[PDB]
Amino acid sequence: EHVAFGSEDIENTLAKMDDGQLDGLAFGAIQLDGDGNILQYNAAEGDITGRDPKQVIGKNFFKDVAPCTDSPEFYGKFKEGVASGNLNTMFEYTFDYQMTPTKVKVHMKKALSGDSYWVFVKRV
């Protein structure tokens, strides 16, 4: 898929893309509901983190999968965005739960329709 990390209209491009198409992206992509449950999780993300995508779909990202993100610096930003109904933030972070610590750039953006939220990830 021909989409760049951080693209201004990424929510339109990805809107309603199915799991197979998401697996074509150059960067990790996770779709979360407003509670942080995982709705979609692509192959590039699994390559970065070791998680098996179909296994983490339905789990809570903050509670279960990624406790290192349960902090004001990641989850706090996410929940503020869910509560506001608007989110577009980009920041670096280190992923380190049961994995070699890995520095990444994270872009969280509210999905176009409904109430879903993207978490995009690339190595830095």
Ligand X SMILES: *C(=O)/C=C/c1ccc(O)cc1
* Sites of contact with ligand X (CB under 6 A): 30, 45, 49, 51, 65-69, 95-97
Based on CB atoms, which residue is closest to ligand X, 9 or 73?
73
Based on CB atoms, which residue is closest to ligand X, 82 or 119?
119
Based on CB atoms, which residue is closest to ligand X, 51 or 107?
51
Task: Give least dist CB 83 to ligand X, A.
Answer: 22
Q: What's the length of the chain?
A: 124
Calculate the alpha carbon distances from 45 to 8, 78, 85 in Å: 20, 18, 25
Q: Cα–chain-centroid distance for residue 72? A: 16
Task: Give least dist CB 78 to ligand X, A.
Answer: 12
Task: Give least dist CB 73 to ligand X, A.
Answer: 12
